[PDB]
Amino acid sequence: LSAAECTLNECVYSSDFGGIATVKYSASKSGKCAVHVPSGTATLKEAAVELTEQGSATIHFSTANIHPEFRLQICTSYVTCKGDCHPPKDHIVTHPQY
Amino acid sequence: YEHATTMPSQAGISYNTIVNRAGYAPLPISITPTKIKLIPTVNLEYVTCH
């Protein structure tokens, strides 16, 4: 992966993966790239994602920080992605806290 | 979802607003008072005529 850009469109921190982040990439080859966040701020729901040649990819994450700025790790390099999340709507969720 | 709004008490004008939460998409909500009625509580006291 070269010339990687991550853009957090809209995020809502909650128990579940209330945050969705979009990453624009320029992959050297078609295929899948393993994706991870070294920091504990958020966890990716997907371990790996298929990459097109020069398309954009979307990921789903859960976090607890209102202003998350985490450097998620991709198959080759890092990219810092920052945005503003929003509080959850429902008071109580029937899900354990991720 | 709790939401508070006030509109002028006039008929024939449709009121447009959106119920918006940061999480969900904003939801259009439209109200148009077709007719507004005011009913006094009358009491028939007596009847008169020629």
Short mmCIF file of C-alpha atoms in Angstrom, two decimals:
data_model
loop_
_atom_site.label_atom_id
_atom_site.label_comp_id
_atom_site.label_asym_id
_atom_site.label_seq_id
_atom_site.Cartn_x
_atom_site.Cartn_y
_atom_site.Cartn_z
CA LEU A 1 0.00 0.00 0.00
CA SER A 2 1.26 3.44 -1.01
CA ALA A 3 -0.33 6.89 -0.69
CA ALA A 4 -2.86 5.82 1.94
CA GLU A 5 -5.49 8.26 3.22
CA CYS A 6 -8.05 7.63 5.97
CA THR A 7 -11.15 9.83 6.34
CA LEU A 8 -13.49 9.27 9.28
CA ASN A 9 -16.82 10.24 7.73
CA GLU A 10 -19.07 9.92 10.79
CA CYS A 11 -18.47 8.30 14.17
CA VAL A 12 -20.66 7.57 17.19
CA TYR A 13 -18.85 6.04 20.15
CA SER A 14 -20.88 3.33 21.88
CA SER A 15 -20.65 -0.19 23.26
CA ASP A 16 -20.79 -1.71 19.77
CA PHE A 17 -19.00 -0.68 16.56
CA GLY A 18 -20.79 2.64 16.40
CA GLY A 19 -17.96 4.23 14.40
CA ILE A 20 -17.38 3.76 10.67
CA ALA A 21 -14.18 5.00 9.03
CA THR A 22 -13.46 5.25 5.30
CA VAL A 23 -9.90 4.82 4.03
CA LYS A 24 -8.81 5.89 0.54
CA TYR A 25 -5.93 3.80 -0.76
CA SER A 26 -3.69 3.38 -3.80
CA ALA A 27 -2.68 -0.28 -3.62
CA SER A 28 0.20 -1.57 -5.71
CA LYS A 29 -1.73 -4.75 -6.53
CA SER A 30 -5.26 -6.10 -6.30
CA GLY A 31 -5.81 -8.28 -3.26
CA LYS A 32 -6.47 -8.31 0.47
CA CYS A 33 -4.53 -6.41 3.12
CA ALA A 34 -4.56 -7.28 6.81
CA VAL A 35 -5.76 -4.37 8.93
CA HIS A 36 -5.19 -3.69 12.63
CA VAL A 37 -5.05 -0.88 15.19
CA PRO A 38 -1.91 -1.09 17.39
CA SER A 39 -3.46 1.33 19.88
CA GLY A 40 -6.31 0.25 22.14
CA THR A 41 -8.47 3.29 21.39
CA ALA A 42 -10.56 1.41 18.82
CA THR A 43 -10.83 -2.16 17.53
CA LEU A 44 -11.52 -3.08 13.92
CA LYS A 45 -14.38 -5.51 13.39
CA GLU A 46 -12.58 -6.92 10.33
CA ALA A 47 -9.13 -8.52 10.52
CA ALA A 48 -8.40 -8.16 6.79
CA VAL A 49 -9.89 -6.22 3.88
CA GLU A 50 -9.66 -6.72 0.13
CA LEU A 51 -8.08 -3.78 -1.70
CA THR A 52 -8.71 -2.77 -5.29
CA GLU A 53 -6.03 -1.00 -7.31
CA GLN A 54 -6.75 2.64 -6.41
CA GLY A 55 -10.15 2.47 -4.74
CA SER A 56 -11.30 3.34 -1.24
CA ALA A 57 -12.10 0.97 1.62
CA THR A 58 -14.40 1.25 4.63
CA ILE A 59 -13.99 -0.22 8.12
CA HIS A 60 -16.20 -0.51 11.19
CA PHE A 61 -14.74 0.23 14.62
CA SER A 62 -15.84 0.62 18.24
CA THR A 63 -14.29 3.24 20.51
CA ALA A 64 -14.94 5.22 23.68
CA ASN A 65 -13.09 8.47 22.89
CA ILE A 66 -15.08 11.51 21.74
CA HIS A 67 -12.12 12.81 19.69
CA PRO A 68 -10.26 9.67 18.57
CA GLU A 69 -6.91 10.18 16.81
CA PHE A 70 -5.52 6.67 16.34
CA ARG A 71 -2.83 5.48 13.91
CA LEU A 72 -4.34 2.30 12.50
CA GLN A 73 -1.88 -0.22 11.06
CA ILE A 74 -2.33 -1.62 7.55
CA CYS A 75 -0.52 -4.37 5.65
CA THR A 76 2.47 -2.12 4.90
CA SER A 77 2.40 1.30 6.59
CA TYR A 78 0.62 3.46 9.16
CA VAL A 79 -1.94 6.23 8.79
CA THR A 80 -3.28 8.55 11.47
CA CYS A 81 -7.03 9.12 11.36
CA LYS A 82 -8.75 11.72 13.53
CA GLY A 83 -12.34 12.84 13.89
CA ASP A 84 -15.15 13.70 16.27
CA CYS A 85 -17.57 11.04 17.47
CA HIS A 86 -21.04 11.43 18.99
CA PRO A 87 -22.68 10.03 22.13
CA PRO A 88 -24.87 6.92 21.76
CA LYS A 89 -28.58 7.37 21.26
CA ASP A 90 -30.08 4.63 23.43
CA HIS A 91 -29.28 4.73 27.15
CA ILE A 92 -28.96 0.96 27.60
CA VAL A 93 -27.73 -1.67 25.14
CA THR A 94 -28.15 -5.42 25.51
CA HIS A 95 -24.51 -5.91 24.56
CA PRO A 96 -21.38 -6.21 26.69
CA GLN A 97 -18.99 -3.30 26.47
CA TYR A 98 -16.43 -3.83 23.71
CA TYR B 1 -37.49 10.06 20.91
CA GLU B 2 -38.26 13.23 22.84
CA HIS B 3 -38.61 16.37 20.73
CA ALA B 4 -40.27 19.71 21.47
CA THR B 5 -41.53 22.10 18.79
CA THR B 6 -44.02 24.97 18.53
CA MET B 7 -45.83 26.24 15.45
CA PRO B 8 -48.10 29.24 14.79
CA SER B 9 -51.79 28.43 15.16
CA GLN B 10 -52.85 29.17 11.59
CA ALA B 11 -54.51 26.89 9.05
CA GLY B 12 -53.49 26.45 5.43
CA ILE B 13 -49.73 26.75 5.99
CA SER B 14 -47.74 23.53 6.13
CA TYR B 15 -45.00 23.45 8.76
CA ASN B 16 -41.76 21.66 7.86
CA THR B 17 -39.15 20.48 10.34
CA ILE B 18 -36.74 17.58 10.80
CA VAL B 19 -36.21 15.41 13.87
CA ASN B 20 -32.45 14.94 13.84
CA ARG B 21 -30.16 12.89 16.05
CA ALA B 22 -26.38 12.84 15.72
CA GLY B 23 -26.45 9.07 15.40
CA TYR B 24 -29.34 8.38 13.05
CA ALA B 25 -30.12 10.27 9.90
CA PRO B 26 -32.36 13.33 10.35
CA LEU B 27 -36.01 12.44 9.86
CA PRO B 28 -38.38 14.86 8.10
CA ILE B 29 -41.55 15.56 10.08
CA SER B 30 -44.30 17.61 8.44
CA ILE B 31 -47.43 19.03 10.07
CA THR B 32 -50.18 21.02 8.34
CA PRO B 33 -53.19 22.15 10.37
CA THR B 34 -56.05 21.72 7.91
CA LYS B 35 -58.65 22.95 10.41
CA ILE B 36 -58.49 24.40 13.92
CA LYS B 37 -61.63 24.47 16.08
CA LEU B 38 -62.57 26.31 19.29
CA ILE B 39 -65.55 24.83 21.14
CA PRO B 40 -66.97 26.85 24.05
CA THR B 41 -68.85 25.00 26.78
CA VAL B 42 -72.32 26.44 26.28
CA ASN B 43 -75.32 26.19 28.60
CA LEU B 44 -78.84 26.57 27.20
CA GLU B 45 -80.50 28.86 29.72
CA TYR B 46 -83.86 29.56 28.07
CA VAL B 47 -85.62 29.82 24.72
CA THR B 48 -87.40 32.93 23.43
CA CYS B 49 -89.57 33.64 20.41
CA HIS B 50 -92.64 35.59 19.39
#
